[PDB]
Design a binder for this molecule. Structure first.
Ligand SMILES: [Mn+2]
Length: 471
């Protein structure tokens, strides 16, 4: 048949987890910074990042279907023993960074629900209970969790939808920002946050997860018709999931763009004092523009539109953090199953990720303040943008070789588009790393920074050289 919902319902199950995977708290933070630094003018790059992320997720589905072994397994079989462990360690660092960003977001939301009675370290300690939830799930062995993901999308959609309905932003301006590429009056940190959003939307570890979830569906690899049908339907399912995630991201960008774009500190301080909520001394009184965090965004939202919008924003961040936790556990489990061949349970993986996440975050929370936590969040964002090439390259390298894919290699346009995509991404990363290095200027710590930079560039050059051999 050409297309039918009867066959569409059979292939369901990867779609919900892929949909929640694109709305971790880091994605909401990237949209949050997008909606105050630049407003609507830098919304089209969200659509571009979502479109190229799907067009990469379909390659993940193709690698999953045509050969039953998912992306971590074929990565184990293809590359040698030396770079396999290094690429695995960089993927682990990316997953740990995502889980640490989750811990920051969940700690901020736990602090913000309770009206500040719970300290930040209290929220970071309260985030440990996800591990005990995973213990109870393994013990009882539900092993389905689709209803969770559906309820998660339900609560997140109704939260940010209530935010959008309350603020009532202009659809003409948001569509103008959406479909007309134009960034007038640009400034170099504005393009820095542009690279931040394009690096944060394409999460690095989603491929491995999508390939493994596609592998979970039984399918005859030899038969061509079932292969093509399952491949195209997983592509449509990923398209629907990414469309829903893109709509929620657009809601976040539009609400923060219309509400607090360009509002100086005096206006928000006067309005929030008129509201009489106790959270007023956080913002200074000076001519500068409003700086928004996951916390400070919630405070300005509460002081503008009452406590209901604040609690809805915080519970939305909590649901997004739960999504990032579950996606991190699943992707990490398949990564350890494939790369170095350890059949670790979900509980051991969540203990590893959550412990390495909470130790620096508990230190920073119990010592330093919320502004340094958001600075660490920005550091994790630029880290995720740094880790983007290790997801862009190897999938393109593996699902184009004729021996591994049989007759389902990529066509000429797909390969050349991937070539220009890898070239623009690694050139952006090289320029951004030297931009970050030139500020440093130290006698010695400049040297170890240069050592890290040249090591990373050598590894990215090796992967790109392997890809150009493959293409
Ligand atoms: Mn992330």
């Amino acid at each position: 048949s050409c297309f039918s919902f009867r066959k569409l319902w059979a292939f369901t199950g990867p779609g919900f987890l892929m949909s929640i995977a694109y709305l971790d708290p880091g994605n909401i933070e990237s949209d949050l910074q997008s909606g105050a630094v630049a407003g609507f003018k830098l919304l089209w790059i969200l659509l571009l990042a979502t479109l190229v992320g799907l067009l990469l997720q379909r390659l993940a589905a193709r690698l999953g279907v045509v050969t039953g072994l998912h992306l971590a397994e074929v990565c184990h079989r293809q590359y040698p023993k030396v770079p396999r462990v290094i690429l695995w360690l960089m993927v682990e660092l990316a997953i740990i960074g995502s889980d640490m960003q989750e811990v920051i977001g969940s700690a901020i939301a736990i602090n913000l629900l309770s009206v500040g009675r719970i300290p930040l370290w209290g929220g970071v300690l309260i985030t440990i209970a996800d591990t005990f939830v995973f213990l109870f799930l393994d013990k009882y062995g539900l092993r389905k969790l689709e209803a969770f993901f559906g309820f998660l999308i339900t609560i997140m959609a109704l939260t940010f939808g209530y935010e959008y309905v309350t603020v009532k932003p202009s659809q003409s301006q948001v569509l103008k920002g959406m479909f007309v590429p134009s960034c007038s009056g640009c400034r170099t940190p504005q393009i820095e946050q542009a690279v931040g959003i394009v690096g944060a939307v394409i999460m690095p570890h989603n491929m491995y997860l999508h390939s493994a979830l596609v592998k979970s569906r039984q399918v005859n690899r030899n038969n061509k018709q079932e292969v093509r049908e399952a491949n195209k339907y997983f592509f449509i399912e990923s398209c629907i999931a990414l469309f829903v995630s893109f709509i929620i991201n657009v809601f976040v960008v539009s609400v923060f763009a219309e509400a607090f774009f360009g509002k100086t500190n005096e206006q928000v301080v006067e309005v929030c004092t008129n509201t009489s909520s106790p959270h007023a001394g956080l913002f200074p009184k000076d001519n500068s523009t409003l700086a928004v965090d996951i916390y400070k965004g919630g405070v300005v939202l509460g002081c503008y539109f009452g406590p209901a919008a604040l609690y809805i924003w915080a519970v939305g961040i909590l649901a997004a953090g739960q999504s990032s936790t579950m996606t991190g556990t699943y992707s990490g489990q398949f990564v350890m199953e494939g790369f170095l061949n350890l059949k670790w349970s979900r509980f051991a993986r969540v203990v590893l990720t959550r412990s390495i996440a909470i130790i620096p975050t508990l230190l920073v929370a119990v010592f330093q303040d919320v502004e340094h936590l958001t600075g660490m969040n920005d550091f994790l964002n630029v880290l995720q943008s740094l880790q983007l090439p290790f997801a862009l390259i190897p999938i393109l390298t593996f699902t184009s070789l004729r021996p591994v894919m049989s007759d389902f290699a990529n066509g000429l346009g797909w390969r050349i588009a991937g070539g220009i995509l890898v070239l623009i991404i690694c050139s952006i990363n090289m320029y951004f790393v030297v931009v970050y290095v030139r500020d440093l200027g130290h006698v010695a710590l400049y040297v170890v920074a240069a050592v890290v930079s040249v090591a990373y560039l050598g590894f990215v050059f090796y992967l790109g050289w392997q890809c150009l051999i493959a293409l």
